[PDB]
Amino acid sequence: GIVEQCCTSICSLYQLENYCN
Amino acid sequence: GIVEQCCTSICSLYQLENYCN
Amino acid sequence: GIVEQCCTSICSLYQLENYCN
Amino acid sequence: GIVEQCCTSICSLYQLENYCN
Amino acid sequence: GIVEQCCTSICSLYQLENYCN
Amino acid sequence: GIVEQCCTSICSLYQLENYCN
Amino acid sequence: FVNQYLCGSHLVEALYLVCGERGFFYTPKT
Amino acid sequence: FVNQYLCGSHLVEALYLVCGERGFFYTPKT
Amino acid sequence: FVNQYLCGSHLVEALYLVCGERGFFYTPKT
Amino acid sequence: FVNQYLCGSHLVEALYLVCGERGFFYTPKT
Amino acid sequence: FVNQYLCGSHLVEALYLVCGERGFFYTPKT
Amino acid sequence: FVNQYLCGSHLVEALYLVCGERGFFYTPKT
Ligand SMILES: Oc1cccc(O)c1
Ligand SMILES: Oc1cccc(O)c1
Ligand SMILES: Oc1cccc(O)c1
Ligand SMILES: Oc1cccc(O)c1
Ligand SMILES: Oc1cccc(O)c1
Ligand SMILES: Oc1cccc(O)c1
Ligand SMILES: [Cl-]
Numbered sequence: 001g002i003v004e005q006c007c008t009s010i011c012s013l014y015q016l017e018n019y020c021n
Numbered sequence: 022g023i024v025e026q027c028c029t030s031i032c033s034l035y036q037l038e039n040y041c042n
Numbered sequence: 043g044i045v046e047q048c049c050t051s052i053c054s055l056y057q058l059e060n061y062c063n
Numbered sequence: 064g065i066v067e068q069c070c071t072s073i074c075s076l077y078q079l080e081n082y083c084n
Numbered sequence: 085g086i087v088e089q090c091c092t093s094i095c096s097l098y099q100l101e102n103y104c105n
Numbered sequence: 106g107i108v109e110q111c112c113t114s115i116c117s118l119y120q121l122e123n124y125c126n
Numbered sequence: 127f128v129n130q131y132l133c134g135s136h137l138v139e140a141l142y143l144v145c146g147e148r149g150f151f152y153t154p155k156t
Numbered sequence: 157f158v159n160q161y162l163c164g165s166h167l168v169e170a171l172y173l174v175c176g177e178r179g180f181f182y183t184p185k186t
Numbered sequence: 187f188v189n190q191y192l193c194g195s196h197l198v199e200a201l202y203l204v205c206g207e208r209g210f211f212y213t214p215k216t
Numbered sequence: 217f218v219n220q221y222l223c224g225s226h227l228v229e230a231l232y233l234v235c236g237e238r239g240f241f242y243t244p245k246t
Numbered sequence: 247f248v249n250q251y252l253c254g255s256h257l258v259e260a261l262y263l264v265c266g267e268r269g270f271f272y273t274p275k276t
Numbered sequence: 277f278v279n280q281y282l283c284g285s286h287l288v289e290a291l292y293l294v295c296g297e298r299g300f301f302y303t304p305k306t
């Protein structure tokens with residue numbers, strides 16, 4: 001999920017926006 | 022400055038990006 | 043909501059747990 | 064001590080409470 | 085109290101060093 | 106660089122002061 | 127608003143610690 | 157694993173700032 | 187009540203940095 | 217003022233994510 | 247890496263939440 | 277290999293307190 005995607009490599013803010021409701 | 026613009030009102034990520042290097 | 047309940051008074055950890063799923 | 068008990072394995076809130084005064 | 089003393093006027097790092105062990 | 110200086114080992118307050126204006 | 131915006135920053139950190147594996151939802155206003 | 161527990165704490169702070177008014181949902185499993 | 191609470195939150199982080207090695211006791215009242 | 221100083225703490229943390237690899241200069245009251 | 251030092255700064259914020267009004271002690275060296 | 281990214285967010289917080297009203301410069305590449 002978010003941890004496996006963003007704790008192994010740096011997520012951009014572009015990438016974090018897909019998790020916002 | 023950054024303090025005046027942003028501790029007075031909420032600044033979005035776009036406005037804060039203006040203060041980047 | 044959360045902000046109105048807990049930014050106006052300190053919520054305890056038990057009050058906070060109300061928002062966990 | 065605290066760093067030893069909680070920096071490899073996650074300590075619960077329960078467990079952290081042993082360090083309160 | 086550190087709270088009484090540093091929550092309305094800024095306590096510098098080296099005033100705060102006074103509360104160390 | 107700072108991360109290379111201080112993320113490899115812990116910088117002291119003196120080493121950190123190098124980066125103040 | 128700033129004071130509540132800063133307060134909400136600290137709320138989410140507290141939620142994270144309290145909720146653990148359960149996770150949580152953060153909806154400041156719906 | 158403490159390493160991903162700490163990473164998660166930073167991720168929630170980042171979500172808070174990027175999501176803004178929309179809020180977010182935080183569920184560790186996936 | 188809440189802004190003394192938030193202030194204390196930042197106070198502990200400064201104490202962690204200045205005290206280093208030494209450690210510290212945190213007592214809100216006393 | 218402590219309210220403005222605590223607001224400053226949170227700004228530098230938001231600058232840190234937005235600015236990324238470009239970094240930034242932080243000047244308080246200029 | 248500074249892994250233990252970073253862990254410690256998270257621990258202190260969690261102790262702050264959990265202990266509330268009684269405060270705590272943080273002794274990094276033992 | 278997110279370790280240095282997480283370390284950098286704590287550095288900016290430490291810089292903020294050490295430099296005070298001097299402010300600081302933070303550049304992560306060079
Ligand atoms: O990939 C990540 C991990 C943690 C915080 C963040 O902003 C990005
Ligand atoms: O207006 C502000 C003040 C502090 C942090 C932030 O992201 C925005
Ligand atoms: O009511 C609150 C507000 C912010 C953090 C917290 O733990 C409780
Ligand atoms: O095991 C840990 C380590 C750091 C913070 C925390 O809440 C728990
Ligand atoms: O006077 C203060 C209040 C809060 C944090 C700090 O580092 C100093
Ligand atoms: O070397 C470091 C890294 C992060 C915070 C700090 O105070 C020192
Ligand atoms: Cl605050």
Ligand SMILES: [Cl-]
Binds near residue numbers: 162163252253282283
């Ligand atoms: Cl970390």
Ligand SMILES: [Zn+2]
Binds near residue numbers: 196
């Ligand atoms: Zn704050």
Ligand SMILES: [Zn+2]
Binds near residue numbers: 286
């Ligand atoms: Zn961290």
